[PDB]
Amino acid sequence: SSDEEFKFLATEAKMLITAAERLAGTDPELQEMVALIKKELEQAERTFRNGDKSEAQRQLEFVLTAARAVMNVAAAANAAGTDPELIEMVLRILKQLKEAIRTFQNGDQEEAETQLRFVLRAAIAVAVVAAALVLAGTDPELQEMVKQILEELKQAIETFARGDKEKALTQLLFVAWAAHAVAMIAAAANLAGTDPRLQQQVKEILEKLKEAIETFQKGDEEQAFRQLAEVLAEAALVALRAALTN
Amino acid sequence: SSDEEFKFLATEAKMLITAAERLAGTDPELQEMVALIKKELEQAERTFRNGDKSEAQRQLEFVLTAARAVMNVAAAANAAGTDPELIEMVLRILKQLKEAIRTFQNGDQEEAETQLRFVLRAAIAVAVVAAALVLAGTDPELQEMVKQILEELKQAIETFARGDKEKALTQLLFVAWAAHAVAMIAAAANLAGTDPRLQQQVKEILEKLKEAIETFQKGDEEQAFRQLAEVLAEAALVALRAALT
């Protein structure tokens, strides 16, 4: 569609791969996925130099989203440490990413792009959840919430594999925001320290997040999504307040 | 065009509007921009009920990108405080978002969508730098680095305004990853605390990022982008190490 956009896409794609290669470390599964996506990047470059440029761009745009996914998965695998629940989720997201790449190579591009839209959001959510658990430290209330978000992401991935992609997409949207909220609450509690004023505001916002999850599980989706958007804003503000004290 | 996709985009777009309203506070310029995007959202919902559902989704997909940009701008202005450099970039990005919305309303949808590609990424960048400045505290090296990122972002906005959209997008891409790098390094410096061994690693990684920016300013973009990509991974790894102590 444009030579200028191709070079721009190729530059960021190599950047995601370079970071993914480093974050993958010694894990053979992460290294295999990065090399697989890297070979798809170089295949799109040969097609741009030789054959169809508009087709090479569509392959590059797919490669870009796969590179960002594998980089978040690799970052999630590092922060996950030895937690089996997080490690298990990294494996499920990796397998679905590999299947989507095969589906794109096979020619079913619409299905593969539909799959990666779900895979990319799940990869970012598990990275944010993994960082939240690390930031939570030894706080039991924070670890319980992070574990509660993890199982919700597990149900969304399983619902997607069952066939109901629409319901799984709605659940993954809720999981993605609840993950971003708990990561800021955990960062707030870390930055608060021994300050009793900020540590009290963290518990209150943490209670509002649990209520938003309970609203989603009950059935009121419209009210649950509104409650979560409010919790995320408050979590960012309390994290800003705590960081200003340091 | 799909009904389930439209309902999905509308739910997410309302989430961004809701969060942007709280982050904007009493800012009259921010709340006005949120209200304009919110009215475009409701306009897309009315078209979905009474007219072309395919055109309503195309409008809603533009609204979603605009709503995510105004949320990051509100978060940036909230975290920026009275910082004049960050304030200056906030209204410049806010101004560009306004023109792109009026462009979409005039019928030129392709030019408006190309504008939001620059505006959204710039809005996320200025929000990350603003969070990096707060995490920096009084650290002069982290403050100087944050200012260096903001200068590159200023050049990218001005180059985009002067016509060369290609060069501006390349610099804005560098600005975005460098912004994410300084935020993780500043978070690592905060999480390290009084650990001299960890602060040396944070200090050295900050220097590797400074060298990456100098390679970009020298003209060698290819090597500068690889260096920035390597620094970003190292910044994420040192913040994890600092958090585990």
Residue numbers in the entry:
A (entry chain A): -1 to 244
B (entry chain B): -1 to 243
Paper lines:
To investigate the photophysics of special pairs independently of the complexities of native photosynthetic proteins, and as a first step toward creating synthetic photosystems for new energy conversion technologies, we designed C2-symmetric proteins that hold two chlorophyll molecules in closely juxtaposed arrangements. For Chl dimer protein scaffolds, we chose hyperstable C2-symmetric repeat protein dimers containing symmetric pockets with tunable sizes and geometries. In this dimeric repeat protein architecture, the hydrophobic core is independent of the small molecule-binding site, enabling full customization for binding with little impact on the overall protein structure. We describe de novo-designed proteins that hold Chl dimers in precisely defined, closely juxtaposed geometries.
SP2 was intended to assemble a ZnPPaM dimer with a conformation substantially different from that of native special pairs to investigate the effect of dimer geometry. The SP2 crystal structure was solved in both the apo state and the ZnPPaM-bound state to 2.4 and 2.5 Å resolution, respectively. The apo- and holo-state amino acid backbones both agree with the SP2 design model to within 1.4 Å r.m.s.d. Compared with the apo-state crystal structure, the SP2 binding cavity widens by ~1.6 Å in the presence of ZnPPaM; this expansion provides the extra volume needed for the ZnPPaM molecules to adopt their unexpected conformation.
